[PDB]
């Protein structure tokens, strides 16, 4: 059974079907199966098979997200039984991401979020126009390895400094490595601001996130 | 004698370009009407939500969703004027914007960087807006000015946007289209235009020298700012360009038809909100909408898709009876090479042949991140060739010129002809494009368009005189800008 | 349930470009018939003059001027086929040329120089038979280059042998695609016939049915057919070789400053050539062709990258359609001396118009310096431009499926379409350029901050190095090679 | 290579049927505006008369005649939505009604009798509430029957309770498809609203957004709206219930013998109804409907299977399109007393015209005996006829792929296409009737030498026996059932 | 691949109606030196019979049946010379064609293919086949049954001459004749004294098997 | 008759290739209409393009 529940969880993701992703997460609950087992032996297995083809140039962005959407359709089905109740953690880094406050551009942030999710990391999307304070509150509440903000304007890119500050005066700036990315964001900005990582793109961000903690 | 009496004759003036039939246009309209009901539009601004609600739209206050009924689109359209005139300080630069095929060009906006030619890019600042204004003031094909690059230097030290309003009107006498205003600050712009006209609000309204753009948040929702720009725009009599910017595969369907349905709904909902706030309000059905590159994770704005969508939005606007403002002469190139020229031409020729009332993009590079002063005059040179091409092929007895063929006869040439002499200025004559044989070219530096262009930039920026605003008047406008920074620091 | 039954619906597939009304096309036609009677057309070839005379034309033997009556123009047009297939050495490269809007591209011809890479930068060196071989290989690779056209002259064979015959075997040997000879010689048309006959194992009936070779000729503007032009036409029609009757007038120079008048001139010239072809052999395969442009009165040069060239080519396509014939026009041409911003602009301007107009063959690809040079860098760039142009030509398909309302509603407000089944299935639909760079500054700078020309060049190097062209059977080749040698001997015997 | 780049191409998708020119539609419009002012329209309902008067109409209180000015007709047309969605109990049965040529079919209503075979002899028995239940099940199964329309009267409830309210729950309970009430009662519209409100758990906002119930009304021809008609319209607009304003005039009877004049009459009647709807509530969902036919002056009957009915329905669809409204017309109707050769003819005649014309809803399926009877046998037969009609409506698609030249050449002279990949992949494309017999005599005789009617009947038996309809939640049903009971009590209290 | 995989790729070539795939497998077979008889019997025929099933279950129709027979023919044309240079099974051979003066053939081609897929080795003589050729084929191939197709009552008559000339050559007594066609009935068969009447293709198959 | 007018005729296969100019020629020659007479003039029926 378990082997079959992991065979499905994988098929669910390589096939890009949210339903089956919920089905398996269901027959999974109806077996007492540890959800963390399903999120790794089961879903991330297929998650990583896609990224594999993504790397060879067989599948593209569409497939990454479509697969990430499935992994979430399943994880949703068991978020109650999971961490909420049992309170168990997954593995392979934890990155909190969202578009800086005052900014609603989200396409990019969502692509970075998926490329990470598919790389093997646990992504926590904070949404967009995320108020600076929420970044901080989510950092000490979730205690993630990486905190990422996205800014696509020169006027919302400036708010990334505030993430650095309010994080320092929260006594957690040293508890997590920050990352900055966006069309106007550059390495110089990352340095000048004091950000740990600079994401040139979704691939560069994934490569640097692991090279920074992996 | 010769005929001087022909009967009914049908002619085509210029070049007509068709993408749709009436059935198809309606196909897209009906689809937009279904979408305006579901999911509908999310209007963040509560002032905007009340106007909609006061007029029939069923507004859900929990979700901020507005379902605009089709009769409000109709009523809105019946109200929006079909034409209006943008004004510059110099009447000669005045520009009409009317439902049809009357094409005009304006520059790109807004870049964060400015190309300086080797070739390097350096984050823009208010001083840059001053030059481009000088350069664009000289560029004949650039009908009016559009905020080209953000003055990042005034960013955080004052009302960046209010500064971005004074410098353009200052260094240019042509209409000024603000590509990125702040709703909260529309009052200032009004006061600046009003200050120009010596405090005569009537003059400011009657002769708008300042217009403004706003973008729907793709997909399907107007932000508090977009709404405030519209609403305020309509109360103050400032022409508003409701220009959406969806992305195929990203914020809208991968298909171009579906992407027009989403683009349409956004724009109309904006235009509906303008006409409801103040009937007869001047608006533009605009678009910069394009296709999102699923294999490059980028938003190419020089693809043949942007060219099509722009040309398609132009036809839609005509369908609805409104002026169009669309993306054109754009490139994804990072340097002025073959690719820039190609994309600049592809994305400009389509909406031009289609009838776009305003085509913005000139000067662009790198998907809109940079503004090249070289590409800008190259672009302006490309528009001359476009206008030529747009003259199509006039067919009259005079132009068929049978007698000339007969006068010159077999084996001769038409050079010594009077007709050839008198029409010397008719054939295209590019200012920058090189048509010399290798020898003369090579004897001039073996220079390519880029350098020949940069040499021009330097010459224009050094010898061109812009008409300055009278000192009395300027101080009055500067004051307001100062009053604006005051407040910014205050808060 | 969901509708699946709609009444008559009017659709426009693609992009339609209009330049004339029927009344206007008629105007140009009447103006031409007028010109064909006065001043008429000077036919230098006595044999052609006889064929004209035998069919009803008034022929003045002292001036050699022929006055073609409209009924012969009409007769010829009823005889000329609306379509014919250009065969390649490889059947998959077959290209149909037919009255309508089916567009195809071919490289330009013929340059006398070739852009190269020496101690840096691209320079220009006079063309040689080997350059034809390289360019042929490149073109065999370019997918948007339907067939091959003599790109440059085999200057190194001039005075040593039959240049035009070398300019025939070399291309055929280096490309499995159809070959269009841009500079044939009336006297040697038999050699081309024989070379194609050899290729088909001496089966002349096969050579006629699967023409892998076609040729072009130019009326001498204004209003006159040279002896060589008449021979190419006459022999062509008799040997079953597709002929491209391509006028090359110049507004202000050899024709009126006005584009319409220039079309009348161009029209008379081409129609006379077509009339000759049909009178020689009814049903002879012919192209209504043009490379007519405008003479720059202010520069004393023949700009071929101007908007007038695009307009004239687009107009000629419309005229060809009007007369029921396949069109062959200039496009993707530039006056730029180097592959820069200008090349890109001109190439796109002169290609977009005739393409949107429906020209059946647009030649110009690879050109630079007003036709004097051939750039392989520019050739692959043009090939990429054609992919973009082909995309633009798909217009905006409007159907219930494309309108995609259910998708819009499914995605809802504030979300994206990246993960929809719809989006994935169509990942290959959007334009996907091979050379045009769409990366953001960072990735681009990391790849070396390369402009399009250097990127194109690296591609050329890669193609010339790794591309394989279906070779001709070694035995068959010997036979074909023999004819060339035979032609060379004769040349020396002169 | 193979072309894959074509210039603008003009196409006609499907089959276009024309009856008028703009000038002609204008003629009918002007003639109607004329009629609307003289003699005007008699509005019996005082409340409607007031709504008309309040908006600018001249109202004579003694004669009750209303003269509607053209600006109100224009105003009303600007207010009416070009489309709206009819929801089913099951979302998959949702049907869009919009200005255009998107065609849909629904059964007819309302017969007073029902066909039922009894010992070989054809037999019709007066209709009862149960018949509505059976017919509703059958229609739920018929795929070409987009939505359900009150087929027959619940005669057995007459005088015992609220017939029209029973005629509401029964259908809704036996079909997951949208229900169109063919015979609503102005006074009881609240009950319908409540029954639909109950279904949606008392959520009136939901009931308005997902209308599973709509209703029809008939102007009393010539030129007058009854009180019931006005109430259905007024209440309908106020409760957010789609209303079908369906005229029912007769050439030679209640309107001119000339079809055009009959259209003017029909046009005035319907427009006044539509004007009322929009003045009551701007944006009210309405149908421009018709069942207008010709009165047989020589038979003193109202033939509804005649070519005039098909023409009038087709014309009304064109008019609806002209005015920008969705159309609802009669089609697939017959005067035949039994499912014979005549039924087949008339049913196809009266359906083909309005379908090719673009009527958005064609009702008539299942009808016989000029509207007096409902035949389940005939209903499944009509459903099959619509599949054939839908096929005919695909017209002749013309593209490079459909022209299939490569297939023709591949197969060559004297061979067949049975084994081509092309043929297999499209095996499901050709028309494939469910009941129409296409076998040769032998196979047919072996199956029992059955005519279409008996075959249809066996199908009816099979469907009624094995088809499953998505039942309504038992609790929700109780609430809905309550309203019916409440309505019944009130009826007895009268 | 190993014989096991080649045999499967050969069945798939059929179930997918893919001539190019049938030819490639045939080459993988010949290359491996594998016996052609095992490639046909356990390979194509496996996939050929599978189609027949799906056809008998209304899941597939004529297009599929003829395509499958053709995908198989492609791959066997490849391994034909081989089978020749080594010598070589059908339920029995069937010779068919439309009779003289009759160029109808779509059906004859269908009956023929409906047999190839059943098992019988069908020998198609074509269309407009003169009576003599019919006889001069019974003596050469000696197939279990000689079938004819007439769609015209005018050519249906020639179906007699096939009898009155196979007895004329003492061969009638060997092969069972068969007639079929739109105008052909069971009676006409009994009259001219033919062995089997072909109602439809399916029927013809079922009836030819009746003579087991 | 086909060969005599310009068509390519392969005598071994008996295949004829008709050039478009002959299709055009034939169409210019064929009458757009003709009358089918009956034994009774009143039954005359016109067949014409339209």
CB within 8 A of E53, min separation 6: which ones? none
Mutating which of B71, B73, B261, B350 best tests the D interface, going by the most D Cβ atoms within 10 A? B71
Chain A contact present for C438, CB below 8 A: no
Nearest to B20 by CA among D99, C14, D15: C14
Q: Rounded to an integer, what distance in angstroms lies between the CA atom of residue D489 and that of residue D161?
A: 7
Residue B401 and residue C249 in contact, taking contact as beta carbons nearer than 8 Å: no
Radius of gyration of the CA atoms of chain F, in A: 17
Q: Do D83 and B56 touch (CB under 8 A)?
A: no
β-strand partners of D301: D296
For C121, list phi and psi in degrees, rounded to 5: 65, 165
Is residue D258 classed as helix, strand or coil in its secondary structure?
Answer: coil
Mutating which of F6, F9, F10, F21 best tests the C interface, going by the most C Cβ atoms within 10 A? F21
Residues of D in contact with C101 (CB under 8 A): 6-9
For C278, list phi and psi in degrees, rounded to 5: -70, -35
Q: Rounded to an integer, what distance in angstroms lies between the CA atom of residue B70 and that of residue D286?
A: 14
Residue C379 and residue C138 in contact, taking contact as beta carbons nearer than 8 Å: yes
Domain E93-210, CATH: 3.40.50.280
Could you check whether the bond before residue B219 is cis, i.e. omega within 30 degrees of 0?
A: yes
Nearest to C20 by CA among B353, B15, B400, B386: B15
Residues of C in contact with B308 (CB under 8 A): 15, 392, 395-396
Q: Rounded to an integer, what distance in angstroms lies between the CA atom of residue B335 and that of residue B343?
A: 12
Q: Rounded to an integer, what distance in angstroms lies between the CA atom of residue C319 and that of residue C325?
A: 9
For D398, list phi and psi in degrees, rounded to 5: -120, 105
CB within 8 A of B82, min separation 6: which ones? B98, B99, B321, B322, B323
β-strand partners of B121: B115
Burial class (CB in 10 A: 0-12, 13-18, 19+), D403: exposed
Beta-carbon count within 10 A of C308 CB: 27
Give the count of alpha carbons within 13 A of C288, CB side only: 33
Residue C340 and residue B337 in contact, taking contact as beta carbons nearer than 8 Å: yes
Q: How far is CA C404 from the centre of its chain?
A: 39
Q: Diameter of chain B by CA atoms?
A: 84
CB within 8 A of B194, min separation 6: which ones? B200, B201, B204
Chain C contact present for D135, CB below 8 A: no
Q: Do D3 and C95 touch (CB under 8 A)?
A: yes
Which residues of A fall below an 8 Å CB-CB distance to B? 60-62, 104, 107-108, 111, 154-155, 158, 183-184, 201-202
Residue D230 and residue D48 in contact, taking contact as beta carbons nearer than 8 Å: yes
Which residue is it, tokens 């905007």? Answer: B48
CA-CA-CA-CA dihedral for D21, D22, D24, D26, to nearest 10: 170
Nearest to C137 by CA among C380, C389, C423: C380
Residues of F in contact with C82 (CB under 8 A): 20
Q: How far is CA D272 from the centre of its chain?
A: 20
Cα separation values, F24 from A46, C77, C286, D405, Å: 64, 11, 17, 21
**Touch between chain B and chain A (3+ CB pairs, < 8 Å)?**
yes
Q: DSSP label at D120?
A: T
Residues in chain B: 491
Q: Do C421 and A65 touch (CB under 8 A)?
A: no
First CA to last CA distance, chain E: 39
CB within 8 A of F7, min separation 6: which ones? F16, F17, F18, F19, F22
Question: What is the β-pairing status of strands B120-123 and B113-116?
Answer: antiparallel
For residue A178, the distance in angstroms to the closest alpha carbon of chain B comes to 23
Nearest to A158 by CA among A176, A182, A127, A126: A182
Domain A94-211: homologous superfamily in CATH: Cobalamin-binding domain (3.40.50.280)
Residues of B in contact with D100 (CB under 8 A): 26, 30
Beta-carbon count within 10 A of D319 CB: 24
Nearest to B204 by CA among B480, B464, B486: B480
Mutating which of A57, A65, A107, A118 best tests the C interface, going by the most C Cβ atoms within 10 A? A65
Residues of C in contact with A60 (CB under 8 A): 427
The C-alpha angle with vertex D243 and arms to D242 and D247, in degrees rounded to 5, equals 155
Is residue E135 classed as helix, strand or coil in its secondary structure?
Answer: helix
Q: Do B34 and D83 touch (CB under 8 A)?
A: yes
Beta-carbon count within 10 A of B6 CB: 8
Q: Do E110 and D418 touch (CB under 8 A)?
A: yes
For A155, which of B123, B155, B295 is closest by C-beta distance? B155
Q: What is the DSSP string of A30-47?
A: TTT--HHHIIIIIIIHHH
The 3 state secondary structure assigned to chain C is CCCCCECCEEEEECCEEECCCHHHHHHHHHHHHHHHHCCCEEECCHHHHHHHHHCCCEEECCCCEEECCHHHHHHHHHHCCCEEEECCCCHHHCEEEECCCECCEEECCCECEEEEECCCCEEEEECCHHHHHHHHHHHHHCCCEEEEECCECCHHHCCCCCHHHHHHHHHHHHCCCCEEECCCCHHHHHHHHHHHHHHCCCCHHHHHHCCCEEEEECCECCCEECHHHHHHHHHHHHHCCCEEEEECCEECCCECCCHHHHHHHHHHHHHHHHHHHHHHCCCCCEEEEECCEECECCCCECCCCCHHHHHHHHHHHHHHHHHCCCEEEECCCCCCCCCEHHHHHHHHHHHHHHHHHCCCCEEEECEEHHHCEECHHHHHHHHHHHHHHHHHCCCCCCCHHHHCHHHHHHHCCCCCCCCCHHHHHCCCCCCCCCCCCCCCHHHHHHCCCCCHHHHHHHHHHHHHHHCCCCCCCHHHHHHHHHHHHHHHHHHHCC
Question: What is the β-pairing status of strands A177-181 and B370-372?
Answer: unpaired
The 3 state secondary structure assigned to chain B is CCCCCCCCCCCCCECEEECCCHHHHHHHHHHHHHHCCCCCEEECCHHHHHHHHHCCCEEECCCCEEECCHHHHHHHHHHCCCEEEECCCCHHHCEEEECCCCCCEEECCCECEEEECCCEEEECCHHHHHHHHHHHHHCCCEEEEECCECCHHHECCECHHHHHHHHHHHHCCCCEEECCCCHHHHHHHHHHHHHHCCCCHHHHHHCCCEEEEECCCCCCEECHHHHHHHHHHHHHCCCEEEEECCEECCCECCCHHHHHHHHHHHHHHHHHHHHHHCCCCCEEEEECCEECECCCCECCCCCHHHHHHHHHHHHHHHHHCCCEEEECCCCCCCCCEHHHHHHHHHHHHHHHHHCCCEEEEECEEHHHCEEEHHHHHHHHHHHHHHHHHHCECCCCHHHHCHHHHHHHCCCCCCCCCHHHHHCCCCCCCCCCCCCCCHHHHHCCCCCCHHHHHHHHHHHHHHHCCCCCCCHHHHHHHHHHHHHHHHHHHHC
> What technique determined this structure?
X-ray
Return the residue of D nearest to B70 by Cα: D81
Could you check whether the bond before residue C143 is cis, i.e. omega within 30 degrees of 0?
A: no
Q: Rounded to an integer, what distance in angstroms lies between the CA atom of residue C235 and that of residue C214?
A: 12
Every domain of chain E and the residues it spans: 3-85, 93-210
Which residue is it, tokens 């520059």? Answer: B107
Domain E3-85, CATH: 1.10.1240.10
Chain D contact present for B33, CB below 8 A: yes
Which residue is it, tokens 């040697």? Answer: C188
Could you check whether the bond before residue C50 is cis, i.e. omega within 30 degrees of 0?
A: no
Cα separation values, B430 from B135, C334, C372, D98, Å: 18, 13, 20, 52
Q: Do A62 and C442 touch (CB under 8 A)?
A: no
Q: Rounded to an integer, what distance in angstroms lies between the CA atom of residue A180 and that of residue A135?
A: 13
β-strand partners of B370: B113, B365
**Touch between chain D and chain B (3+ CB pairs, < 8 Å)?**
yes
Beta-carbon count within 10 A of C21 CB: 15
The C-alpha angle with vertex C218 and arms to C336 and B421, in degrees rounded to 5, equals 60
Structure tokens given for B43: 């209007």
Residues in chain A: 214
Q: Rounded to an integer, what distance in angstroms lies between the CA atom of residue E98 and that of residue E179?
A: 10
Q: Do C339 and B344 touch (CB under 8 A)?
A: no
Residue B144 and residue B174 in contact, taking contact as beta carbons nearer than 8 Å: yes
CB within 8 A of C415, min separation 6: which ones? B219
Q: How far is CA D351 from the centre of its chain?
A: 11
Residue C345 and residue B389 in contact, taking contact as beta carbons nearer than 8 Å: no
Residues of D in contact with C1 (CB under 8 A): 92-95, 143, 146
Domain A1-78 class, CATH top level: mainly alpha
In angstroms, this model's resolution equals 2.7
Structure tokens given for B22: 């009436």
Residues of B in contact with A61 (CB under 8 A): 294-295, 297
| Dihedral over Cα of B176, B179, B180, B186: its sign | positive
Cα separation values, D245 from B467, C125, D177, E92, F43, Å: 66, 82, 21, 71, 48
CB within 8 A of C338, min separation 6: which ones? B446, B448, C115, C122, C368, C453
Q: DSSP label at A100?
A: B
């Amino acid at each position: 059974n378990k082997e079959e529940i992991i065979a499905k969880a994988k098929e669910a993701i390589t096939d890009f079907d949210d339903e089956l992703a919920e089905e398996v997460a269901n027959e999974a609950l109806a077996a007492g199966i540890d959800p963390v087992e399903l999120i790794e032996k089961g879903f991330t297995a297929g998650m990583e098979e896609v990224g594999e083809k993504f790397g060879q140039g067989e599948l593209f962005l569409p497939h990454v997200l479509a697969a990430a959407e499935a992994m979430n359709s399943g994880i949703k089905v068991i978020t109650p039984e999971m961490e909420k109740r049992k309170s168990q953690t997954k593995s392979l880094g934890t990155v909190a991401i969202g578009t800086i406050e005052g900014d609603i551009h989200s396409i990019g942030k969502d692509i970075v979020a998926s490329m990470l999710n598919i790389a093997g990391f646990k992504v926590v999307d904070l949404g967009r126009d995320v108020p600076i304070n929420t970044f901080v509150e989510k950092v000490k509440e979730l205690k993630p390895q990486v905190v990422a903000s996205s800014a696509l304007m020169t006027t919302t890119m400036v708010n990334q400094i505030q993430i650095e500050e309010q994080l320092k005066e929260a006594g957690v700036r040293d508890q997590v490595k920050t990352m900055v990315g966006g069309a106007p964001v550059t390495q110089d900005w990352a340095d000048k601001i004091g950000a740990d990582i600079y994401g040139e793109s979704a691939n560069d961000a994934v490569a640097k996130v692991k090279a920074a903690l992996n | 004698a010769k005929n001087n009496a022909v009967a009914g004759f049908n002619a085509l003036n210029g070049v007509e370009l068709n993408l749709f039939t009436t059935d198809e246009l309606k196909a897209i309209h009906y689809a937009t009407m279904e979408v305006l009901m579901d999911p509908g539009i999310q209007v963040s601004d509560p002032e905007a939500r009340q106007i909609f609600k006061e007029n029939g739209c069923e507004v859900n206050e929990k979700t901020n969703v507005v379902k605009i009924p089709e009769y409000l689109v109709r009523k809105a359209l019946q109200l929006a004027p079909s034409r209006f005139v943008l004004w510059g300080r110099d009447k000669k630069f005045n520009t009409v914007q009317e439902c049809g095929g009357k094409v005009h060009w304006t520059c790109f906006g807004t870049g964060v960087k400015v190309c300086k030619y080797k070739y390097v890019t350096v984050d823009s600042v208010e001083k840059d807006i001053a030059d481009i204004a000088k350069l664009c003031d000289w560029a004949e094909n650039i009908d009016y000015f559009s905020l080209p690059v953000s003055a990042r230097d005034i960013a955080g030290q004052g009302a960046q946007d209010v500064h971005e309003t004074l410098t353009p009107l200052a260094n240019t006498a042509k209409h000024f289209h603000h590509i990125d205003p702040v709703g909260e600050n529309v009052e200032y712009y009004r006061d600046i235009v009003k200050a120009y006209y010596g405090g005569d609000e009537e003059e400011a309204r009657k002769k708008p020298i300042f217009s403004m753009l706003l973008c729907p948040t793709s997909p399907l929702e107007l932000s508090v700012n977009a709404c405030q720009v519209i609403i305020k725009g309509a109360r103050f009599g400032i022409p508003v360009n409701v220009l959406s910017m969806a992305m195929s595969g990203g914020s809208s369907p991968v298909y171009l038809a579906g992407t027009l349905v989403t683009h349409n709904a956004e724009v109309l909902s904006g235009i509906v909100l303008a006409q409801l706030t103040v009937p007869g309000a001047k608006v533009w059905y605009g678009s910069s909408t394009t296709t999102f590159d699923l294999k490059k994770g980028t938003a190419p704005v020089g693809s043949p898709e942007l060219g099509l969508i722009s040309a398609a939005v132009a036809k839609l606007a005509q369908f609805y009876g409104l002026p169009s403002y669309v993306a054109g002469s754009x490139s994804d190139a990072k340097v002025p090479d073959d690719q820039a020229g190609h994309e600049k031409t592809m994305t400009t020729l389509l909406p031009a042949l289609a009838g776009a009332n305003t085509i913005y993009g000139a000067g662009m590079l790198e998907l809109g991140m940079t503004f090249s002063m070289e590409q800008l005059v190259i672009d302006n040179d490309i528009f001359s060739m476009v206008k030529k091409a747009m003259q199509g092929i006039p067919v009259s007895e005079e132009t068929l010129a049978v007698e000339s063929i007969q006068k010159v006869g077999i084996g001769n040439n038409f050079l010594a002809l009077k007709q050839t002499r008198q029409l010397v200025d008719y054939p295209s004559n590019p200012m920058l494009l090189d048509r010399h044989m290798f020898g003369d070219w090579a004897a001039a530096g073996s220079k390519d368009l880029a350098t020949v262009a940069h040499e021009k930039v330097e010459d224009v920026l050094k010898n061109h005189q812009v008409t300055p605003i009278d000192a009395d008047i300027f101080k009055d406008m500067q004051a307001i800008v100062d009053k604006a920074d005051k407040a910014f620091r205050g808060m």
